[PDB]
PDB file of C-alpha atoms and ligand atoms in Angstrom:
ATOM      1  CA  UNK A   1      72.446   2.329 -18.289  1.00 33.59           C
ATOM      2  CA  UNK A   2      71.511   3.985 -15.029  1.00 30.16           C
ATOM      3  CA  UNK A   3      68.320   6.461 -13.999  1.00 28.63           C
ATOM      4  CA  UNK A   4      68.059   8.524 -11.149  1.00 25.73           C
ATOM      5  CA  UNK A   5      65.767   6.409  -8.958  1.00 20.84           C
ATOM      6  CA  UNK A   6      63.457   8.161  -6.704  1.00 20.66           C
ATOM      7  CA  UNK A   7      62.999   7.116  -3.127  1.00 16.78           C
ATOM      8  CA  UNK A   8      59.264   7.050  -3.452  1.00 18.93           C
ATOM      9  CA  UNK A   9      58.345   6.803   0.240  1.00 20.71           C
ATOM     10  CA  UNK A  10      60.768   5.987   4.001  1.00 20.24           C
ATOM     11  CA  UNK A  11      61.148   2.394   4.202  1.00 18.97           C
ATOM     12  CA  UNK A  12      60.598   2.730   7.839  1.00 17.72           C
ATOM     13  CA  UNK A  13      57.400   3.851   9.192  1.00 18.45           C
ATOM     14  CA  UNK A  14      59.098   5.335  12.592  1.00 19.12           C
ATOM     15  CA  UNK A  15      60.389   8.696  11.844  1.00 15.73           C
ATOM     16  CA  UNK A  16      62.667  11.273  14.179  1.00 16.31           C
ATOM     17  CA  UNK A  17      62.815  15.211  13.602  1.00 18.17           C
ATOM     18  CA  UNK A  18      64.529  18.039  14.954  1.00 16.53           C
ATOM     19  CA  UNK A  19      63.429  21.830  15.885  1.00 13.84           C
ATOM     20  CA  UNK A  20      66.892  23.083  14.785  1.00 13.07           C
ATOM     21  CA  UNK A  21      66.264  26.856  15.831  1.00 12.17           C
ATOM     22  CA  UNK A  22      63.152  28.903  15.813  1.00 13.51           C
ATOM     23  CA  UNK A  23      61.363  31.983  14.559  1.00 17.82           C
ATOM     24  CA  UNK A  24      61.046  35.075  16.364  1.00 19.18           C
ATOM     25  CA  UNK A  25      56.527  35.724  16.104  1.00 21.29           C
ATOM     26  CA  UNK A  26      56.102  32.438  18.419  1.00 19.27           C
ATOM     27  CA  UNK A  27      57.287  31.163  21.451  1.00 22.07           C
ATOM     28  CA  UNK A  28      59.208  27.974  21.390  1.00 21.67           C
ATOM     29  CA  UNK A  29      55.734  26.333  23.170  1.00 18.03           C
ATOM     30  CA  UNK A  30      53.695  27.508  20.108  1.00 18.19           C
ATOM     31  CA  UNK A  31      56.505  26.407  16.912  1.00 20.36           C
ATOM     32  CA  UNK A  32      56.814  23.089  19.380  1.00 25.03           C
ATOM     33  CA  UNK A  33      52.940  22.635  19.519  1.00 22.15           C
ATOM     34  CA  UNK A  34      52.487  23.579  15.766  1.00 20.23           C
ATOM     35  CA  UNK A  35      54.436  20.767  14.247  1.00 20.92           C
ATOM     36  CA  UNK A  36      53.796  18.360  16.565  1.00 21.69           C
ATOM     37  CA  UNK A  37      49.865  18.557  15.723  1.00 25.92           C
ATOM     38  CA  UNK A  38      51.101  19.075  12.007  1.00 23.86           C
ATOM     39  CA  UNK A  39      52.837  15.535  12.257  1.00 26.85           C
ATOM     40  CA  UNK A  40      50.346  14.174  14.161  1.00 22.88           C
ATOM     41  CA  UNK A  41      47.971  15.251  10.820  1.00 26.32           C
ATOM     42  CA  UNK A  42      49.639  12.383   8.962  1.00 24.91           C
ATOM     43  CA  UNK A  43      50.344  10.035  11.674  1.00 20.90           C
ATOM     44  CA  UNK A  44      46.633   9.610  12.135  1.00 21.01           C
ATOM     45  CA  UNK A  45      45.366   8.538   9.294  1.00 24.19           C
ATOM     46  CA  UNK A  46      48.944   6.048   8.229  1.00 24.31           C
ATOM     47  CA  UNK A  47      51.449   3.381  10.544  1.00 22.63           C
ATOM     48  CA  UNK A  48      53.734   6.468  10.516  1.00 24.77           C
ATOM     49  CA  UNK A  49      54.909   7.343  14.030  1.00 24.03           C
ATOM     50  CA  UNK A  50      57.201  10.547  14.331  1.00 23.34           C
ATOM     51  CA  UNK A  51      59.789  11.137  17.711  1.00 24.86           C
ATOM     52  CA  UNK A  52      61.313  14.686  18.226  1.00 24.93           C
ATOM     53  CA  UNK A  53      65.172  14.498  18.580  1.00 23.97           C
ATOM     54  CA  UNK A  54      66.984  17.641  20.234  1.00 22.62           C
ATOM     55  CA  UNK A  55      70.307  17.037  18.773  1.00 22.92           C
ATOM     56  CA  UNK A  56      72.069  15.270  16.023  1.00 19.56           C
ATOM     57  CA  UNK A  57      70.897  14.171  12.981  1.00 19.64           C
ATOM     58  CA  UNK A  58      66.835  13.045  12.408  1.00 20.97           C
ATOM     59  CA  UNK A  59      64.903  12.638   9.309  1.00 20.37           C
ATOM     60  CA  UNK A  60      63.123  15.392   9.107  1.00 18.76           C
ATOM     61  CA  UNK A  61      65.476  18.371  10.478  1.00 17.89           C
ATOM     62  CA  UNK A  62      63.419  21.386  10.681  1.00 16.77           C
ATOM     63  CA  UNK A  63      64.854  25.124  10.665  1.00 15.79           C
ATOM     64  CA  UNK A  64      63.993  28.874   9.733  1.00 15.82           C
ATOM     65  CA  UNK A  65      65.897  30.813   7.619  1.00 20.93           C
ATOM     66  CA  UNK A  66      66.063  33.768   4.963  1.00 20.43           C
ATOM     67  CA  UNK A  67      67.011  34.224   1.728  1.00 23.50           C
ATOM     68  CA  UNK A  68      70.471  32.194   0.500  1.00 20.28           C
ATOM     69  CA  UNK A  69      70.382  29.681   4.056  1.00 18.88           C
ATOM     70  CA  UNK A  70      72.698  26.488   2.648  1.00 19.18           C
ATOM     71  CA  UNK A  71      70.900  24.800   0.027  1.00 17.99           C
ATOM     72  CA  UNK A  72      70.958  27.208  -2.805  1.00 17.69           C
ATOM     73  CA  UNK A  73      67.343  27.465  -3.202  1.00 16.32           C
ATOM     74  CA  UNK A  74      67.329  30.939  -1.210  1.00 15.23           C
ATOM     75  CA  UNK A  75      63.903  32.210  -0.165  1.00 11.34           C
ATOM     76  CA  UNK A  76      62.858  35.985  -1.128  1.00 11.31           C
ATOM     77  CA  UNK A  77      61.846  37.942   1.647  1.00 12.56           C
ATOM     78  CA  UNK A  78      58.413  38.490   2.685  1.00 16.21           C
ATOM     79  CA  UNK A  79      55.256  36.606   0.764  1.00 17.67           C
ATOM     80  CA  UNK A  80      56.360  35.036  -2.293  1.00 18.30           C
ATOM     81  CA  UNK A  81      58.019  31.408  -1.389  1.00 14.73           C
ATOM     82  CA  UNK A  82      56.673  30.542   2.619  1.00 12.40           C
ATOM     83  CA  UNK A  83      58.769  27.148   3.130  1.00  5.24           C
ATOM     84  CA  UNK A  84      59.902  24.360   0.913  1.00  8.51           C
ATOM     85  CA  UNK A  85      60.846  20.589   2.074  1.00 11.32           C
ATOM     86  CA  UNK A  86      62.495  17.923   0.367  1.00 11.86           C
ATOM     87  CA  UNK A  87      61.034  14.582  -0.307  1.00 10.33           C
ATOM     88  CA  UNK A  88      62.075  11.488   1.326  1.00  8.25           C
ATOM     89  CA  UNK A  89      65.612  10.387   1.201  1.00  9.32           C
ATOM     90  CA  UNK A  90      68.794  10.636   3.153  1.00 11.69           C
ATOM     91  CA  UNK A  91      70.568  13.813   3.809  1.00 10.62           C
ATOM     92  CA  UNK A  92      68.448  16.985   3.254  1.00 10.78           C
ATOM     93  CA  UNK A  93      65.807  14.475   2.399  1.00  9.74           C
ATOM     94  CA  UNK A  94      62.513  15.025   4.274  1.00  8.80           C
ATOM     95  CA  UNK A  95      63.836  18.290   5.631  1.00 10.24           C
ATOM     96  CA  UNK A  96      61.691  21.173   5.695  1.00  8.55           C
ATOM     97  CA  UNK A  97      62.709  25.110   5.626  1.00 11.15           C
ATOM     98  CA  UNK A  98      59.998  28.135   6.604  1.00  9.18           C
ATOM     99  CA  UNK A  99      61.109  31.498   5.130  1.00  8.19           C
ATOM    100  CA  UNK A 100      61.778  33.730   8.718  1.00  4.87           C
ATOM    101  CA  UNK A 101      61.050  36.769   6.487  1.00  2.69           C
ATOM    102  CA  UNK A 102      57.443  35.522   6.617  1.00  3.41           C
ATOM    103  CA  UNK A 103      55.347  36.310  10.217  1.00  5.16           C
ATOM    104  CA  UNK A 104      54.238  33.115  11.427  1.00  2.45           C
ATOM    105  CA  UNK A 105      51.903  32.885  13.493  1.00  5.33           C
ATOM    106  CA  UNK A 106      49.158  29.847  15.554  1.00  3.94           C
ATOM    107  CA  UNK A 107      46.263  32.564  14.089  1.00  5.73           C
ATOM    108  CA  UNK A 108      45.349  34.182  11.070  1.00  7.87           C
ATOM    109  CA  UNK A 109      47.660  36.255  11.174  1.00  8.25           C
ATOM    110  CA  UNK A 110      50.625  36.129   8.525  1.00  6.66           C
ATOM    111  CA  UNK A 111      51.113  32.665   8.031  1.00  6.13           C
ATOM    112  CA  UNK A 112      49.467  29.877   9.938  1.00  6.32           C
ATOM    113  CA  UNK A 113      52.736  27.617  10.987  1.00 11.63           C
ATOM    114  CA  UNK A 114      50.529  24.612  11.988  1.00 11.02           C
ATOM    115  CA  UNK A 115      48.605  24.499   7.791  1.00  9.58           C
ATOM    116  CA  UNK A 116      52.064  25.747   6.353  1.00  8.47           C
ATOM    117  CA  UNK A 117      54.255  22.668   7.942  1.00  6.42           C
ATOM    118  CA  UNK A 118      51.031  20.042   7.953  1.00  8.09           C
ATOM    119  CA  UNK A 119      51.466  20.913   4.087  1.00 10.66           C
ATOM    120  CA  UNK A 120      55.465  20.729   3.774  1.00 10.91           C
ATOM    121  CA  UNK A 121      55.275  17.815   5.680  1.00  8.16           C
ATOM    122  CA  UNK A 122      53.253  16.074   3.100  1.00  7.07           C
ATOM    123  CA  UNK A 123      56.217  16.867   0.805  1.00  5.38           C
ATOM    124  CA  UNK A 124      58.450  15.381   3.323  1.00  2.86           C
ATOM    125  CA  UNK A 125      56.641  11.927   3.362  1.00  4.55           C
ATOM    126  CA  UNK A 126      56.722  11.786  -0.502  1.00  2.93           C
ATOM    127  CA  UNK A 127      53.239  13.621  -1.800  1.00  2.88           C
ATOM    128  CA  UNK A 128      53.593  16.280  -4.570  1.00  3.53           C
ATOM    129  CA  UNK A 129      50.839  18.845  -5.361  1.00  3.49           C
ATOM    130  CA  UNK A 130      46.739  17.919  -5.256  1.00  4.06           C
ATOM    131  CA  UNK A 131      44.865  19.560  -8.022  1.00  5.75           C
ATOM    132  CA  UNK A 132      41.872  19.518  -5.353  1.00  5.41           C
ATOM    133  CA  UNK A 133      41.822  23.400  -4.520  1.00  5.92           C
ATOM    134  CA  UNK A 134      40.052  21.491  -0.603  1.00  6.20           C
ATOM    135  CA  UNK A 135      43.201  19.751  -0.347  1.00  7.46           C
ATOM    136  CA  UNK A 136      45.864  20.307   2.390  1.00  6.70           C
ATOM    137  CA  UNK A 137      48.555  19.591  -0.659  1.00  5.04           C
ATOM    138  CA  UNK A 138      47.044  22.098  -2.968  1.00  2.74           C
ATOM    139  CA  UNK A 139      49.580  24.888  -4.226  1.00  2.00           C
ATOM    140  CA  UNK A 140      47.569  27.740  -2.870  1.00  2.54           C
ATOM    141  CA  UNK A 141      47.301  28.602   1.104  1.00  3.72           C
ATOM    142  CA  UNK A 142      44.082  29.635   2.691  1.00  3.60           C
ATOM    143  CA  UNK A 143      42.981  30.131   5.973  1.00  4.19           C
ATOM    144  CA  UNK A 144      39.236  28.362   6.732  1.00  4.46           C
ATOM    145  CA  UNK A 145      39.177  30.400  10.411  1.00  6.77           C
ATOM    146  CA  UNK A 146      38.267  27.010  12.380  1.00  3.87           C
ATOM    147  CA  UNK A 147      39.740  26.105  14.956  1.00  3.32           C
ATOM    148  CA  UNK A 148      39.534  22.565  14.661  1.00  2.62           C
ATOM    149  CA  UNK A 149      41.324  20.790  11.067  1.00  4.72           C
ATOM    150  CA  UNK A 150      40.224  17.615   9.568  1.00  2.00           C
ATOM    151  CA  UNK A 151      42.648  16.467   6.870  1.00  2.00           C
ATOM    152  CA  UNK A 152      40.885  16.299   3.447  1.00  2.00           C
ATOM    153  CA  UNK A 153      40.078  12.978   2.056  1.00  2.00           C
ATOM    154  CA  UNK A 154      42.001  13.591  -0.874  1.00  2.00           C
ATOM    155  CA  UNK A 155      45.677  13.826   1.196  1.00  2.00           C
ATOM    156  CA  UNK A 156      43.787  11.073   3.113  1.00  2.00           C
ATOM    157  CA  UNK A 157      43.823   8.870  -0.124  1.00  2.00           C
ATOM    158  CA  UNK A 158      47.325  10.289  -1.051  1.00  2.00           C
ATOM    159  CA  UNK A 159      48.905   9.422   1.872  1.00  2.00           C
ATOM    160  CA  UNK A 160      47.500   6.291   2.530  1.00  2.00           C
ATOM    161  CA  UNK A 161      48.541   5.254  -0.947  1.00  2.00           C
ATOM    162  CA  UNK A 162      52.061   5.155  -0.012  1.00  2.00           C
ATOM    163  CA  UNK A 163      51.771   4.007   3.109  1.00  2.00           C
ATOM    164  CA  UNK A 164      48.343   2.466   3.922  1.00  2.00           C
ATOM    165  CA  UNK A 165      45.943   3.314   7.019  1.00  2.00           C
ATOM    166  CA  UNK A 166      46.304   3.203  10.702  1.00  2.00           C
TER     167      UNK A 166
HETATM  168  C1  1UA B   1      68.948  16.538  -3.668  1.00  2.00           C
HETATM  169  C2  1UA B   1      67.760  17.230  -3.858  1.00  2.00           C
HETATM  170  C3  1UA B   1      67.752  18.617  -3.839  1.00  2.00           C
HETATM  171  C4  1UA B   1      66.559  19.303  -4.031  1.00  2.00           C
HETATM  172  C5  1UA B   1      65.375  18.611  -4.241  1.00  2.00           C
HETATM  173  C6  1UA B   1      64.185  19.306  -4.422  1.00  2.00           C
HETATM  174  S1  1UA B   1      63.792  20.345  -2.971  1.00  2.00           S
HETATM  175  C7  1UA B   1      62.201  20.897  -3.331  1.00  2.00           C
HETATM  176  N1  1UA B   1      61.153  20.079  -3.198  1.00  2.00           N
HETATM  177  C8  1UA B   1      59.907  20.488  -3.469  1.00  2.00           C
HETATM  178  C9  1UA B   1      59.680  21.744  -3.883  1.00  2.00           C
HETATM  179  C10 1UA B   1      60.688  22.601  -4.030  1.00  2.00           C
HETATM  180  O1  1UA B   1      60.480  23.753  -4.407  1.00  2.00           O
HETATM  181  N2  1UA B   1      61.995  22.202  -3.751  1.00  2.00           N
HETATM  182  C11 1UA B   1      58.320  21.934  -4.101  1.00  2.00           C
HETATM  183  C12 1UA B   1      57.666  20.835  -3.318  1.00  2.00           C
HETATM  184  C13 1UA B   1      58.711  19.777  -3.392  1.00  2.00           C
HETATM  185  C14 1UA B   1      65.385  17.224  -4.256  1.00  2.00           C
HETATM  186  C15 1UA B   1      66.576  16.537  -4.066  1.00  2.00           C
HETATM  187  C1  1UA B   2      52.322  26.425   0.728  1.00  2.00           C
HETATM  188  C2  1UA B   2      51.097  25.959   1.184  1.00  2.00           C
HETATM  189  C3  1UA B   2      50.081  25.672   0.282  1.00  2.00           C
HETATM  190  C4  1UA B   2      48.856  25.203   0.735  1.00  2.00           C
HETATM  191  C5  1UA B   2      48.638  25.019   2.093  1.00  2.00           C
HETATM  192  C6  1UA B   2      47.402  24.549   2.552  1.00  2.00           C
HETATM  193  S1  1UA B   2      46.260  25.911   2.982  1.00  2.00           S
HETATM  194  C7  1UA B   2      44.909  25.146   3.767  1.00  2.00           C
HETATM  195  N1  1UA B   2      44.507  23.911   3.466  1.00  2.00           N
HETATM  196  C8  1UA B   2      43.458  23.353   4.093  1.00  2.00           C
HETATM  197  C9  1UA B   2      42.786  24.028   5.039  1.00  2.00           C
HETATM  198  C10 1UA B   2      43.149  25.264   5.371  1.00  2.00           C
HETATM  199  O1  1UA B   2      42.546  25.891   6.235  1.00  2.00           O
HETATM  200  N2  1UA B   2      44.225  25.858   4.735  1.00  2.00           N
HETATM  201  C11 1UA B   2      41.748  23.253   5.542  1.00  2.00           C
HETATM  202  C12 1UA B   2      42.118  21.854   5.169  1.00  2.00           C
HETATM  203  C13 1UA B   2      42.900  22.091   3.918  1.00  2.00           C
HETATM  204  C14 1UA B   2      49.654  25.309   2.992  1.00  2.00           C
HETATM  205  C15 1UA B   2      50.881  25.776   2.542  1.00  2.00           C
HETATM  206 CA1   CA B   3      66.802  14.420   6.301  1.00  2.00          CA
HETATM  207 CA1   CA B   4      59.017  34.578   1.252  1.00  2.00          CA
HETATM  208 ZN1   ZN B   5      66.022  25.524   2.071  1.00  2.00          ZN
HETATM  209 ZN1   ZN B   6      53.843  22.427  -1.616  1.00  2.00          ZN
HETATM  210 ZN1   ZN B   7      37.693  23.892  18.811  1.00  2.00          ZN
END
């Protein structure tokens, strides 16, 4: 017999990703600037090392979009579903998608891009869901108001567990 096995974690720690297009509510400076530092949540605390390609195909390809946008999980217009991201793997593996019927924003406003993508990202590198409510990976999004983030020990521990410290 066969399973389905599940590509748990990359085999490589040195990653690429691609800004495919952008939203509207930032400038390209601010969506640039918010996943960088939401990578750079993860790279700091693992061996993982992440390089932005602008064209072809990366790992992690990165894109807005609304409602039915090519993978038929279709997002539902504004609040609701934010962004989903696949877990590691080729193809749409480790992509991540942000719902462009949501206002993003680098504030408190809307949705905070930078928490939103630190969080799909997680997905993207092979964590599921924290039952911590403090945790980055928890279900639920909140906005602390700081201007400075610390990643939770909990993802901390998560992460690591796949891929050990830096
Ligand atoms: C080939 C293939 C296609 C789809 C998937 C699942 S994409 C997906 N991932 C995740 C969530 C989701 O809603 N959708 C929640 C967090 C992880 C996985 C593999
Ligand atoms: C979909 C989704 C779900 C949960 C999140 C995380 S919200 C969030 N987490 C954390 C902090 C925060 O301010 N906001 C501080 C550190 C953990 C982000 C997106
Ligand atoms: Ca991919
Ligand atoms: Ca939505
Ligand atoms: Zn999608
Ligand atoms: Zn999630
Ligand atoms: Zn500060």
């Amino acid at each position: 017999y066969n399973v389905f096995p599940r590509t748990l974690k990359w085999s490589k720690m040195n990653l690429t990703y691609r800004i495919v297009n952008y939203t509207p509510d930032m400038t390209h400076s601010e969506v640039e600037k918010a996943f960088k530092k939401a990578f750079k949540v993860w790279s700091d605390v693992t061996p993982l090392n992440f390089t932005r390609l602008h064209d072809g195909i990366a790992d992690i390809m990165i894109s807005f979009g609304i409602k039915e946008h090519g993978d038929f999980y279709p997002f539902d217009g504004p609040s609701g579903l934010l962004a989903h991201a696949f877990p590691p793997g080729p193809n749409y593996g480790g992509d991540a998608h942000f719902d462009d019927d949501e206002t993003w924003t680098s504030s408190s406003k809307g949705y905070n891009l930078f928490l939103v993508a630190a969080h799909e990202f997680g997905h993207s590198l092979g964590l599921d869901h924290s039952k911590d409510p403090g945790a980055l990976m928890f279900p639920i999004y909140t906005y602390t108001g700081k201007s400075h983030f610390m990643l939770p020990d909990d993802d901390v521990q998560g992460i690591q567990s796949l891929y050990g410290p830096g």
